[PDB]
Amino acid sequence: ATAAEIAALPRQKVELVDPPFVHAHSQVAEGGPKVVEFTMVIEEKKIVIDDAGTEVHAMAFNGTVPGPLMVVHQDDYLELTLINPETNTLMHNIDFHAATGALGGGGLTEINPGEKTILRFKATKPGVFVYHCAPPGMVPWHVVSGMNGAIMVLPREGLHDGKGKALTYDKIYYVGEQDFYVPRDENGKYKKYEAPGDAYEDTVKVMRTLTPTHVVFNGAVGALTGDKAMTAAVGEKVLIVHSQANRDTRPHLIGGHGDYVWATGKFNTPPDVDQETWFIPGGAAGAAFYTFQQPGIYAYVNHNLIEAFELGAAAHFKVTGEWNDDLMTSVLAPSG
Amino acid sequence: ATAAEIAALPRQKVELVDPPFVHAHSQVAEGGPKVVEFTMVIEEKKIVIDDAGTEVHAMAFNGTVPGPLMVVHQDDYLELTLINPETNTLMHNIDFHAATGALGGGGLTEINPGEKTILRFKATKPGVFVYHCAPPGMVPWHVVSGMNGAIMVLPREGLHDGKGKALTYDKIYYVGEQDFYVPRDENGKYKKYEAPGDAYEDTVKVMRTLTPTHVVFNGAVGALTGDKAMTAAVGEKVLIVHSQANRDTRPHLIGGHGDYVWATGKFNTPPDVDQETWFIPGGAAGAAFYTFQQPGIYAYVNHNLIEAFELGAAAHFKVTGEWNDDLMTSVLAPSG
């Protein structure tokens, strides 16, 4: 409770890392409640989202779409230092779905270019939760320009299945999924603009059709493919955290399953098991736990396959290890 | 069980109230099975749904969009007197998703202007359920002109969490979400018509694109905002019933959570907990239970933020009490 007791608590400063990677943390909390501190600089910046050179004026927490994942434990205090540099042109703020009161922090964090703010909240509820910018009058526009990310609030005792048993992951990835609404000119070619402000009226028009032009993981078509593929090994236990701040998605691991999925993203709700494809509503985060059993390339997709393969929502995993013929075997290879 | 047994049961006449309020009722059932009696008159009427004077020909149970919430207990009989006055122009009926047989009651209740009908059914399954009009050949048209609502079938012992702890609400609010399909002319302006029949062909064209022009709560943009804000106090337990007869929604309380959410709306299915954003599929109702911990303004939204902030799907809660600094605090107010 008391502001004096909260001053007595240990501090712990964390350096953030860019998605899909997640900063060092422990699954089981060592010691009692802490004030965990993060800093993020907001950058408005031109990003290129596909191979044609299509451009978006992105509004990015820490310079990335999505914003980085922050990890705390249940009953920690998270303390954010949020900086809007004077080179920015817009007011921004932050709403944590994880937090209680003042529009998730958004009423207390309104910062113009050149301003900074520090917010603290108590992470009372365990799970993965979306955060996003939400300035009055301009909420969808900042969210759909990439201004969103996730936090994970781990239970103090680490993850468990529905019936008590410990689930320890070997590695964790964060896939942030983004719907973009890029205006087209008379000839169906993507438009380009000088400042974010100039794109406003044209983007609102595309938004009102409810149809994105691109749906991407980590900011761009193919950002998580080729040599940017996520990696694992046969027998390795992976947690995939997935968020969508504005629109529904239906993740699917091609060649795999979600062994335990917290599809609502909340760790006091017991996970579904043996999932082929799970569902994360717009404005939520989810998490899926899988142990790889076969080596090779996997694709991780939004299973609206038009959104996956036409709009850009596909990532790769490259998995090393030995093939298991009991699980699957080619009895007769393709032959005439 | 037998007709004679039903004829012996006490009757209870209930006066309906307009959404978002809900008629007087008891959470734990007072005594044994009753025949609960309700009367609704159907009104066809022009409504104005936005601040630009946009009109819809609404087809409204008891004159409101959505129609009123009816509350019974498990194993009561709901006996509905449905009235279609001579001042109306179309045939209407009612399908309760809570009922078993004859298309939810739809096949037994087709009434022309000038007619009435009395339907009785046993409320065998506890939960919140959609009701809606469904005239053969004309089902979606009546549903997206506002002709839908919800009933709540309480367990006789009241609400309980997933492991038997009782859940008593202080307040209950009914939010009905509606997708509308308003035709435009060649110049972008919404069309007006002089009767409901005349809008039919044009509306069907809009409906087939599957893209609503407006998504609203309680019949209009801003219906439940500012001074028509729903009210609670810090410490109050509130039940929010949300329905959508046609299209999916993803409710979120900005600054809050769904402590217990029956996302499917069915009380024999254990609620999800600590929800940030939950999902209600088109054709269903869901309910969220939450204890306010912080005072101030809260927005209640469909978290496709385009639908919420551009299309109309936003309500307010005004909450009184004192601020809890342990839960959230501004460490450094915005500043250069």
Place this chain on the structure above:
Amino acid sequence: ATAAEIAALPRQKVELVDPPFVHAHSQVAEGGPKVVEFTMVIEEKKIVIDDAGTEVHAMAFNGTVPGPLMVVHQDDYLELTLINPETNTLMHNIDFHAATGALGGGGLTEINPGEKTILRFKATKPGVFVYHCAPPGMVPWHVVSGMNGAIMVLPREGLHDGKGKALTYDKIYYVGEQDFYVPRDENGKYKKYEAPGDAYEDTVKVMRTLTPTHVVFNGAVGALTGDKAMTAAVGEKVLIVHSQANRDTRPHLIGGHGDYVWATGKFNTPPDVDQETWFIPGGAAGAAFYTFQQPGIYAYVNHNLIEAFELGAAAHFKVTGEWNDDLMTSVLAPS
């Protein structure tokens, strides 16, 4: 399981049947693990999908949209012989969402016209699961041309509720839902094409709007209405398996409920109960169990009612038996 052990398992050839019917199987497995063998031939053919004569070039497992349901039990091996006849024009393959490895078997089954393949996998997880075609660089096009179906992997002990009480169905039906994306010319008329590859660029343009032209059960508007309605009696227990390989759906039985719904489709996840409307995400199969209580015509719909009644997603059940006045009665008939 030693190599010797796998090698000596009994084999069983199963003859497939067309949706919405399901091949003969037992709910409780009889005996120990088996290798269950199925054969399917791929057919590219023009089908008529609505009452206006709109045609599509379907890419059809076994000649049907959806593909047939295959039924095995947990820890059975499923061994599929997949044939692509010389008269087809395109390479096809298969990805079982039930299988582990090589893109669900898609990396091992790429067959040109004139070729066959045999894939074997162990069915380790119980549930209903989508299967679909998935050729590299053309995945959505084969899926939305109807090249998808479902399998059911039953628990060895049959279905159970949450409480561990057995659930035994009398009848099972498979409803495959398909989103089609049919191009139109500038007059608003649906286009017709000579060969499947001719339709490609125009179809991808419709696909990118994310708005299907038609949403149908069993390959056409009205396919499961009228004389082809599904049948049951008062007192029968019915399992409805439903799949959608690309797009969300929200099934509803008008006049009925889902007593037990495995909405995610996976039998180790306890079912939801007393459902009005349930939700199956694109890329999944779901299952609903219901005991009919009343006779009459029921409609079974996607409960986006525009998709149901304007785009084609509506089926019928005709149920025989006697009316129960306790459950519902007309006290005063329209007057």
